[PDB]
Swiss-Prot record, chain B:
Probably methylated by PRMT1. Belongs to the flagellar radial spoke RSP4/6 family. Flagellar radial spokes contribute to the regulation of dynein arm activity and thus the pattern of flagellar bending. They consist of a thin stalk, which is attached to the a subfiber of the outer doublet microtubule, and a bulbous head, which is attached to the stalk and appears to interact with the projections from the central pair of microtubules. The radial spoke head is made of five different polypeptides (RSP1, RSP4, RSP6, RSP9, and RSP10). It is found in: Cytoplasm, Cytoskeleton, Flagellum axoneme. This is Flagellar radial spoke protein 6. It comes from Chlamydomonas reinhardtii.
Length: 201, 48, 249, 52, 249
């Protein structure tokens, strides 16, 4: 059982074809574990399409994805990535109509870049995009729980501020009650951190 | 390993006559067969 | 959600589709359906339809049933039918034989209002009008009887009961949301495994109301209101299916 | 849940079998009754002739 | 078993009690209830009642809640109220601060039509008529709002939600079978715990419809059909209170 990312572009939404696509997706054995209708801004779209970053089609591609609300879906299936790649069919809409009819790109997609769907290529990009659009959707418990990778992540996170917080806790030595120490270290962390700034009125 | 947890969950008994393992299994079976509307809250409201 | 279809809801949502009943008949149904329901032991008894006649005394037909079992891989609802010329008094609609139904099938045009008429078929055969009416009603009932998919569910002792935890049919503007009552709840047979052009569906998304019209029998209508989660079906017209359907599509 | 479906089907089949067994027992009883009545009808003339 | 009371079943079951609305206003309601329900982001919106004015232009009042949570032993519903002279266009009823909420209970007599009317009370205090209407609606809702017992249940996070498995109330004739809306499901508080002779229940055993009328507020009716579990309520008439209850009974 694997989870892939997918999104319905504004061309299949301005034509009111989103629900038909969702029903077709559910008919082929997929499961929509998470869905959200949203509207990307220019900066968010540019950050999402980082792999292209200045290619020939990038201007029109980023100008199109911010022309209306899209849908974002997380599909779940044993062969989700490959099966969804097949279900969408070939990227080029005219080549899709020629080769494989009765595919979502052939039916709903038109006019080249407006292929009416977007899917993930590999599990790396799938996980990256899922975390991009669903920050709180749990997943991938095997690629983060390696003792080497766990130690590496703890190393990346602790030197910035937690070591300093522990040093301050040891030097100040507040009430021996552990709850006060927990509160003090939490305040120190939420006050001193390299990622977020300090907020003042 | 998982064997320890499985062997442990079958000795512990709950307020009901069955073990906690069997109780959770029956709750999941009912949830899977019925497919309730708001399922997660139906676990605390309807199945148990 | 609903336990039984409500007559006033059916008449209110099918008013556009042309399925209407007169004022006197409406009030008489309101006052007389419970009486006939309680006279028998039927847990359910509702208006089934209104067949048109030649003299002007339309046949009001109601059907009822007690319990809904599952038997030989299908939902077998043991039904009982009643008819009337006025909404007040309800008379039994006797079931017909097999060969009598085969002969029933050969009578066309609207049957007359008088239930004492006799039709002549061919060695000659005499066919009572009540037999013809029952033949037509059972034909329509067998052909088209819509309920939203998974609105019912099995239970202990294997009786098809309503599903009180019905979430609502998803994508209700498509025929995969509705099914014949005879189809078992678990099975995936729905209103899409029959002929491709014998059902029409209109949908209002803002009010969330779906209307399903049968084209094989142009008098059968069904509504599903999603916000209230209430569904109901009616028949208005003579019990004739249009065999010349293909030229119409 | 698969086992639950199987057990439910088995229980329904058992009840149907009980109903059918009752029906066939009633039919057999009726047939034996008819046999007894026919035997008595056949026997009567000899009885009224030579055993009253 | 229902999740929200219909506006058609309420008008049908309460028609005899005089709780009726004009046909044009009924069609306008049917169209413009979902419009206001979506314009205001409310999951539930139903017609609450109809108040009489010195003009023919009565105030139709509809209430709707988005969240409903347990708070200090009270089932607090975050209700919003809307008013309309005609069924088409709705306006809002802003809540009333306590000073004017106490200076509005002394103003009596049936309201005028224009909601821009200023009553003058005793130095002189100017109070808007919309404030008086809001006060009267709040008083009637506090005194009267009635639902069947066990029709609501408490889930995790302490929210009151409809009981999908509500099987109905045995002994619908007894007042014990009914409770106020703001009573917690666990607490055994009902209408029996009110004053002895302030609620009259007439139950038709045959049709299975019970009818509860408020005598302290004469214009509040609540029907409960038990054959199909459907309960609704409406207030029709002026919002004034019946002080001298002891003499009348």
């Amino acid at each position: 059982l694997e989870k892939t990312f997918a999104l319905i572009k504004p061309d299949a939404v301005r034509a009111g074809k989103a629900q038909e696509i969702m029903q077709l997706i559910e008919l082929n054995g997929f499961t929509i574990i998470a869905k959200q209708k949203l509207q990307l801004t220019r900066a968010r779209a540019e950050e999402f399409y980082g792999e292209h970053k200045g290619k020939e089609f990038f201007p029109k591609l980023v100008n199109f994805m911010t022309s209306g609300p899209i849908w974002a879906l997380v599909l779940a299936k044993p062969g989700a990535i490959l099966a969804w790649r097949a279900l969408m069919g070939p990227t080029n809409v005219f080549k899709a109509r020629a080769e494989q009819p009765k595919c979502l790109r052939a039916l709903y997609g038109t006019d080249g870049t407006q292929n009416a769907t977007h899917g993930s290529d590999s599990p790396i990009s799938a996980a990256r995009e899922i975390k991009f659009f669903f920050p709180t959707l749990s997943g991938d418990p095997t690629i983060y729980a390696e003792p080497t990778a766990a130690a590496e992540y703890i190393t990346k996170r602790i030197q910035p501020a937690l070591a300093k917080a522990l040093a301050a806790l040891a030097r100040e030595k507040p009430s021996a009650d552990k709850f006060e120490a927990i509160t003090f270290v939490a305040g120190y962390l939420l006050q001193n951190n390299p990622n977020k700034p300090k907020v003042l009125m | 390993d998982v064997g320890q947890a499985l062997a442990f969950l079958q000795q512990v008994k709950t307020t009901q006559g069955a073990s906690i393992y069997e109780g959770l299994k029956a709750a999941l079976a009912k949830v899977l067969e019925d497919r309730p509307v708001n399922a997660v809250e139906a676990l605390e409201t309807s199945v148990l | 959600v609903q336990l039984e279809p409500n007559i006033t809801l059916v008449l209110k949502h099918l008013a556009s589709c042309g399925a209407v009943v007169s004022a006197e008949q409406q009030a008489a149904l309101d006052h007389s359906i419970p009486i006939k329901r309680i006279e028998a032991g039927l847990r359910s008894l509702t208006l089934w339809g209104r067949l048109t006649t030649l003299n002007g005394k339309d046949y009001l037909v109601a059907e009822g049933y007690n319990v809904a079992s599952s038997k030989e891989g299908a939902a077998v609802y043991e039904t009982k039918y009643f008819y009337s010329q006025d909404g007040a008094r309800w008379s039994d609609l006797q079931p017909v034989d097999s060969e009598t139904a085969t002969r029933c099938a050969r009578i066309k045009g609207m049957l007359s209002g008088d239930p004492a008429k006799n039709y002549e078929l061919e060695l000659v055969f005499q066919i009572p009008e009540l037999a013809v009416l029952r033949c037509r009603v059972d034909a329509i009932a067998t052909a088209t009887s819509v309920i939203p998919t998974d609105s019912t569910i099995l239970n202990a002792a294997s009786q098809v009961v309503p599903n009180r935890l019905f979430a609502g049919a998803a994508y209700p503007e498509k025929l995969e949301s509705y099914q014949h009552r005879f189809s078992l709840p678990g099975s995936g047979v729905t209103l899409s495994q029959d002929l491709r052009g014998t059902w029409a569906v209109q949908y209002d998304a803002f009010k969330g109301v779906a209307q399903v019209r049968s084209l094989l029998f142009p008098g059968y209508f069904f509504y599903y209101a999603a916000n209230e989660l209430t569904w109901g079906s009616l028949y208005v017209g003579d019990g004739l299916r249009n065999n010349d359907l293909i030229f119409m599509l | 849940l698969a086992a639950n479906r199987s057990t439910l089907a088995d229980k329904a089949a058992s009840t149907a079998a009980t109903v059918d067994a009752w029906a066939e027992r009633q039919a057999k009883m009726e047939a034996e009754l008819q046999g007894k009545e026919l035997e008595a009808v056949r026997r009567r003339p000899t009885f009224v002739l030579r055993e009253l």
